[PDB]
């Protein structure tokens, strides 16, 4: 008997990564972008995309030769073998989805409360935060597959709303409000925000952890990554220009929960405000459905077992059911211990260390996968610099959030050495070799 997985086409994989990227930036941290970057936000999204494309250079080179549902972990193991670092990075990869759920949790509430006229409490937000995570945990048992089939349709609808937001957003604008502020008292904020908005291009995760469930992976994994980054880059900027141009920046800081919902009111009314708020929840729900069922489930099973099943359903929690509750538990927890700006900082920090190890892997395997050494040196220094800029900012901005970021990297390394002593779990070439 030979089983076969249901496999994704190029555009299915693109829609998947685009949906996750959009849900994490357009409807999640756009209100954070107003407070820090301000009018430099459209320039921020470009600069953020630059780092991503540098990361993509290593991913697309490694993903062209190495096929695995392990993703980065596969590449990393091929370079540095099995050890405590490889295992920490696997748990770190799982944690990247965990904290992502916290970011999607906050975003969902930001657009939901103003829709039904509810005050912005620490408690009234928290009710939605626990609730929405509980809804997607319960979805595992009846609806996870059905929502996953709708994801492609939802992404398009969410895109079409944004596609009308630009075409009809470039009408009653303030071209004197979109002019890039060149004064270094607000320029450094653009570069500091680009360290946070690195997460805006988190498409690497969902794609690489589904690489064995994608048609012609050696070809379509690189392409999906490359196409995904270039699409959202145009979407971010085109919406960023419109949002700043139609609304005063001080009104955007106080509407940090819903940045675009209030932005639609002046030039589309409450009917246009209704269309944004509805299409927001749908976009964040489908992004989370993708993160839990396709990413978190895969990341957890690999971190726990040391390998992955050859044949599994992507759109359910296919193995180790306790992992679903644990992932959901920390998903709510992070959305409580930290704020909208707090969650985003951690998420971006986790990803950068994964990418840094991906770049380091590309360096080591450059004989096998190919590439230009001097570009493989360049992006490494860039990402590290951006990673340091995020730590530098957080230390001089938020004490409470700064230590939360530091604790993560230690707590992951502690858990690894402990877990490796208890279970003796090893990682092997099983991840990418066959048969």
């Amino acid at each position, epitope marked *: *008997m*030979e*089983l076969k997985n249901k496999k994704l086409s190029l555009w299915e994989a693109v829609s998947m990564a685009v949906g996750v990227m959009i849900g994490a930036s357009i409807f999640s941290i756009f209100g954070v972008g107003a407070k820090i970057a301000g009018r430099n936000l459209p320039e921020t999204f470009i600069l953020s995309g630059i780092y991503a494309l540098l990361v993509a250079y290593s991913y697309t080179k490694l993903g062209a030769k190495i096929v695995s549902n392990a993703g980065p972990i596969a590449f990393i193991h091929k370079a540095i073998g099995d050890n405590i670092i490889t295992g920490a990075l696997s748990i770190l990869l799982w944690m990247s989805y965990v904290i992502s759920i916290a970011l999607f949790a906050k975003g969902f509430a930001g657009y939901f409360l103003p829709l039904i006229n509810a005050p912005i409490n620490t408690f009234n937000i928290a009710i939605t935060e626990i609730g929405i995570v509980a809804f997607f945990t319960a979805l595992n048992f009846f609806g996870s597959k059905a929502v996953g089939r709708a994801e492609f349709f939802i992404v398009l609808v969410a895109l079409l709303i944004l596609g009308l937001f630009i075409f009809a957003g470039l009408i009653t604008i303030h071209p004197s409000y979109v002019i890039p502020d060149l004064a270094p008292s607000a320029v450094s904020g653009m570069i500091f925000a680009s360290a946070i908005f690195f997460l805006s291009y988190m498409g690497f995760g969902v794609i690489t952890n589904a690489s064995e469930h994608i048609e012609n992976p050696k070809k379509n994994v690189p392409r999906a990554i490359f196409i995904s980054i270039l699409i959202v880059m145009f979407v971010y900027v085109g919406v960023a220009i419109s949002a700043i141009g139609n609304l005063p920046i001080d009104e955007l800081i106080k509407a940090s929960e819903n940045a675009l919902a209030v932005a639609a009111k002046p030039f589309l009314g409450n009917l246009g405000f209704l269309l944004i708020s509805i299409g927001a929840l749908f976009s964040i729900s489908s992004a989370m459905n993708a993160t839990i069922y396709g990413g978190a489930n895969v990341a957890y099973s690999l971190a*726990k*077992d040391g*390998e992955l*099943p*050859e*044949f*599994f*359903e*992507r*759109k*359910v*929690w*296919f*193995k*180790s059911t306790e992992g679903l509750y644990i992932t959901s538990a920390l998903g709510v927890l992070f959305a409580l211990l930290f704020n909208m700006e707090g969650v985003a900082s951690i998420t971006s920090a986790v990803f950068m260390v994964i990418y840094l190890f991906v770049i380091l892997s590309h360096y080591i395997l450059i004989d096998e996968v190919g590439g230009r050494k001097e570009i493989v040196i360049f992006s490494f220094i860039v990402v590290l610099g951006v990673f340091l800029l995020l730590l530098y900012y957080q230390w001089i901005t938020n004490r409470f959030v700064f230590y939360g970021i530091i604790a993560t990297f230690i707590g992951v390394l502690i858990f690894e050495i402990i877990y490796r002593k208890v279970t003796k779990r*090893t990682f092997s070439n*099983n991840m990418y070799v066959k*048969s």
Partner: antibody
Amino acid sequence: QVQLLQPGAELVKPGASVKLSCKASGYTFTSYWMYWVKQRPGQGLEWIGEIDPSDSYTNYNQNFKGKATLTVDKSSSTAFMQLSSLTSQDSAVYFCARSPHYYGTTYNYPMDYWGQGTSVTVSS
Amino acid sequence: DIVMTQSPSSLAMSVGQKVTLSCKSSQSLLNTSNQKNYLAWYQQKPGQSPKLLVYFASTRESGVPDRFIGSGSGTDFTLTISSVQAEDLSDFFCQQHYSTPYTFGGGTKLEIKR
């Protein structure tokens, strides 16, 4: 190409234990179930139990819940069945057999590849 | 626990004849969602391990001769050998692969008549 290596025969004294081995090659050991099957000479087949070699999860036939214990060695792709307190009623051929495992789904599968079997004699 | 019953225990058929092996289950083996019947057939020659012939009631296993056809539904199932060849003498077992305590039929022994 895909094969399961079991030793031919085993002689063991009554009341003692025996550990039977099933070495797997040609496929990824942890991606499939490992089942064990009992057959008495000239009679039918009994399913003893299943092990998931990835996490060593086990599920037993009620009639074997104290007689048989299933373990694996991931590193060497080998499955073991421990048989305890052996009587003459345990004199049989014991097969290991692979079964496909499609994880997050409603499909269960039969046994597509079998070992040659280990015939266990329990005698003084 | 599902009990599997095969009838008869043994039959004799001559080379070229059509053989019909019957197998019944205590419970329906049809899963009404994703609608397949979880029944397998095995062939066991003397001294050898069992060989999977058919799974999910109707699909032949890779490498199995055309002569072997599985059919049936719910609680009643058939294995048909369209035309028996001398080397087909063996013990045929059905097995449900529906729910965890997997169970076999007592087998049907096929001898070649001459």
